C-alpha cells in the first residue's frame, strides 16, 4: 500500500501524466495494440519488440488525490485522461486466454492495481474487488507478447514518465 | 476546486495540508491537537501544515507539526470506499491565530439544499490540470441521498453524501482529498471521491462526518 513511484523517484500521478511501462525482462519491447482472433481493428494490448518505448498509459482512480498507492483500484488507459476510449480490460478470448484489451467505456473503479514486484512493478487484475488478484503476464504469439492473466508469472515493469 | 474562487488568507483557518515532502491531501483542524482527513490519505510520517494560504511560500504565520498518531477508521473498506475517515493527533498543540482555528463537529446531519463551503489546493480544471498557489473555495449544496444513489447506483453507502451541481462546472477535484465540507458552521464532510471533476450528473461524494462524531470523541478521549 505504498505510493507508486516512477523512474525519477516521483510519485505516479492520478490521471495527470502518462507513463511508459518499461519491461525489465524484454528490454526491446513496448506497449502496442494488435489484432486478436477474427477482429479487424487491433484491440489487444501487446508488448511489441518493434515498438519501443511504446504507447504510454495513465493510471486513474476516482479518489480526489493526485498520488497513486499500490492499494488503489485503478483504471489503466491509453490516450487522454478524460477520453473514454483506450481503457484496459480483461476479456476471455481465444487464442490468448484472459486477454488484456481496450474498450470505449470507463467504469468508476477499475479492476487493476500496481504492486511492487522484485525490482519494478507488476500489473495485477481483480475479477472482483473482494478477491485475490491475478498477475498480468505475457503470452508469446505472432512474434509479440500478448498481455494476459498469467498468475505467478507477472511481467515486471519500471514506470517511466513520458514527460 | 473547479469553478471556485480564491478563499483569502483568514477565510478558512481550520483548513490544513497533509505533507510528506509534497502536498498530497487536505484536512480539518477540529481542536488544537487533532485533525480529521480521509482514510485513503493515510501515509507514514505525515507532517501537518497549518496557517498556509500560499502552498508554495514558506511564510512565518504558518506552523509545521508532525503527526504523532494517524488513526484510520477501523472499518475503512478500501474495496467500497466506505468509512473514509482518519484522525491525526499532532505531536504538539497548534498555536491559534488569524489563520489557525478549529472547526467543530456537527450536532446533526445536514439537509438537502443546505449550502456548504468546500476548500482545497487541488486541480482547478475539469479537463487537464492546473494547481493553484492559494487556497480555493466553493459553495455547493447538499443533495438528497436518493439523488446521490441515483447518480452513482450501487456505490453510495449510508456514510457518504453528495454535494454539488448535476449541471457540472463546480466540484472538488484531485488534490482536494481529505478537505473540509462546512455547512452552518460545522464540519459535515470530508472530500472523498467522484467520477471525474465537475462533470454533468456526477457530483462529488463526501464522508458523512455526522455519523462519526461519537467515534471521533471516543478516540480523542482514549488517546
UniProtKB/Swiss-Prot annotation, chain B:
List each copy of the Peptidase S1 domain by range. Answer: 1-221
The protein's required cofactor(s) are namely: Ca(2+)
Q: What is its EC number?
A: 3.4.21.4
Q: Which UniProt keywords apply?
A: Calcium, Digestion, Disulfide bond, Hydrolase, Metal-binding, Protease, Secreted, Serine protease, Signal, Zymogen
Picking any one GO molecular function of the record gives: metal ion binding
The keyword Calcium is annotated on this UniProt entry:
yes
- What does the Swiss-Prot or TrEMBL cofactor note state? Binds 1 Ca(2+) ion per subunit.
What's a single GO CC term here?
serine protease inhibitor complex
Residues recorded as binding substrate, renumbered to this chain, are: 171-172, 174-175, 177
The source's domain of life comes to Eukaryota
Q: Where is the active site?
A: 40 (charge relay system), 84 (charge relay system), 177 (charge relay system)
Q: Which InterPro entries match?
A: Peptidase_S1_PA, Peptidase_S1_PA_chymotrypsin, Peptidase_S1A, Serine_Proteases_S1, Trypsin_dom, TRYPSIN_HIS, TRYPSIN_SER
Pfam hit, one: Trypsin
Query: How does the record describe the protein's post-translational processing?
Result: Subsequent cleavage after Lys-125 leads to alpha-trypsin. Further cleavage after Lys-170 yields pseudotrypsin. A cleavage may also occur after Arg-99. Not sulfated on tyrosine residue(s).
Listed GO biological process terms: digestion; proteolysis
Which residues are noted in the entry as Ca(2+)-binding?
Answer: 52, 54, 57, 62
Q: Which reaction does it catalyse?
A: Preferential cleavage: Arg-|-Xaa, Lys-|-Xaa
Q: Is the Disulfide bond keyword given for this protein?
A: yes
Q: In which tissues is it expressed?
A: Synthesized in the acinar cells of the pancreas.
| Annotated disulfide bonds | 7-137, 25-41, 109-210, 116-183, 148-162, 173-197
SMART domains according to UniProt: Tryp_SPc
What subcellular compartments does it reside in? Secreted, Extracellular space
Q: How does it assemble?
A: Interacts with SERPINA1.
Family to which the UniProt record says this protein belongs: Belongs to the peptidase S1 family.
Name this protein carries in UniProt: Serine protease 1
What organism is listed for this UniProt entry? Bos taurus (Bovine)
